[model samples]
Target: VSPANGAVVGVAHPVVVTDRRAVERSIRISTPHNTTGHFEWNVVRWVPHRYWPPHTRVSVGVQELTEGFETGDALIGVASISAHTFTVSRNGEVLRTMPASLGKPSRPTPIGSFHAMSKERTVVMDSRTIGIPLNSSDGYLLTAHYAVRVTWSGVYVHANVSHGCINLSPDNAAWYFDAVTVGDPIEVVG
Candidate 1:
């Protein structure tokens, strides 16, 4: 007996499939779902826990027939120049746009497409690590928090940078840190 399909909305999805050979591992769902009964009966009912978001399409299958289902954007995009500007967007919606002071002429911020290399809640910034002598007037070690690194050349979007860094306000930095994910596209535009 096949369980009733369609006419179901939200998380109340009850998919009834009948097969003596269908096992726990055989049932799959596009969303998180659960099933009822444990016997070898020919009837099994699967229900989902949460409803799919509105205006969305989902598909499910047991074998190699599933395809073309996407949960989020193909890629989350964000941007920051070597100067005072950064914007975060998704799909076609722009989320955040704000000011960011970037590096100066002697050490201009890299210009190109990039992605978030990593994140740090708090890190120690040492000019010596990047070859700046300790005695140099612009050299010093300081603690930087809420950092989003876009370049492997040691460039980051965080606190003040006397040389090369994209510096944002404390609030913006925290917001960006909380919102962005690893590999989220970070573009540097002039």
Candidate 2:
């Protein structure tokens, strides 16, 4: 919701800034943390623009904090906290989570460290498909048209699968597809 009223667009993500400096400058401002000892804002919606290109718009909400949170010093945009990691922000933010299908008992998914090398928006199940059976006889293929490989051994953060990749719900997939880029760091732990 904006300072004036809530509005929705159609093709691009909306932009929201919560930093004190920004709020002080905007014509209208609102903060939920004014008396809570910290300033925290959330992006309530994503309104795409009419002419925006695919994945062109990335929106985020913001709020200031009088004191830092456990994750880190709360200064600007959003923060993502996971079991093994906490990602802070500067200007943009997108939160995404999906249940990953790690490797099986024999070839358990590597659980040390890794980063997302690259991602794609298409699902090409060629001979390269590894480990699990590609057919339903073994297990259903829970794969998204968009996928991200964060490790070298075919361990990826992608759609659903029996034993080789992450399985994200359709909503999560869309968020992940647009949130991360080629060089984003990804870490997996036991």
Candidate 3:
């Protein structure tokens, strides 16, 4: 169950069912309000067609199993490298600001607008993912909590320090993780 029960997810979040029995038995997706979508076989994931409405609840049913999730309101994040901080906003109003440490000089964080591509409660930050071998001076493979990926080359807003990522304190990381959904805007600037 990718979305999990009662989860608040992004408008583009897919309903993932990994249960083999459920796939064999077939599954159905529905909502109290009408939606348009198609099923894709990532083998276990069914993406809702297009973007889900701003705030809507979706349900997945398969035999005795049913999971539901809701889409959240519009939200965005702005990370300012010069200020060493990031702000969370919704409906054009800033909700919170938190300290962040961007990539060091050697591996400066890329500046631009990006979508929150993915979310993970915890992830292994492997230096090798970016081509820095494990034994190098800046190489490391560590578990980071509350990771929200913002780039294809492993850049993320997560707990702890810089290695081309926007690092935050545990508290701030947790809050950011909960407040964001995939496809939300995340802007980075000097």
Instruction: Judging by TM-score against the true structure, name the best candidate.
Output: 3
| lDDT (10s digit) by residue, model 2, range 43-130 | 3222222212332222233333221111111111111222322232322342333454454444444454333445777665443255
The residue ranges of model 3 lying beyond 4 angstroms of the native Cα positions read 1-71, 129-131, 159-163
Model 3, 9-85: lDDT tens per residue? 66656666665544745778887666766665635666655556667778888768787877788677778878878
Model 1 agreement with the true structure over 1-190: per-residue lDDT tens digits: 2222322222222344453454556756564332232323346544433323322334545455443232333233334454357776655577778687777656656676555667899988888987888778668787888987767577786733565677778998898787765445666676
How many residue pairs of model 3 clash at the backbone?
1
Error of 1 at 73 (Å): 4.0
Q: List candidate 1 stretches off by more than 4 Å.
A: 1-83, 159-163
| Cα displacement (Å) at residue 8, model 1 | 30
- Report the Cα lDDT for candidate 1: 0.57
Ranking by lDDT: 3, 1, 2
Say which prediction, candidate 1 or candidate 2, comes out ahead on lDDT.
1
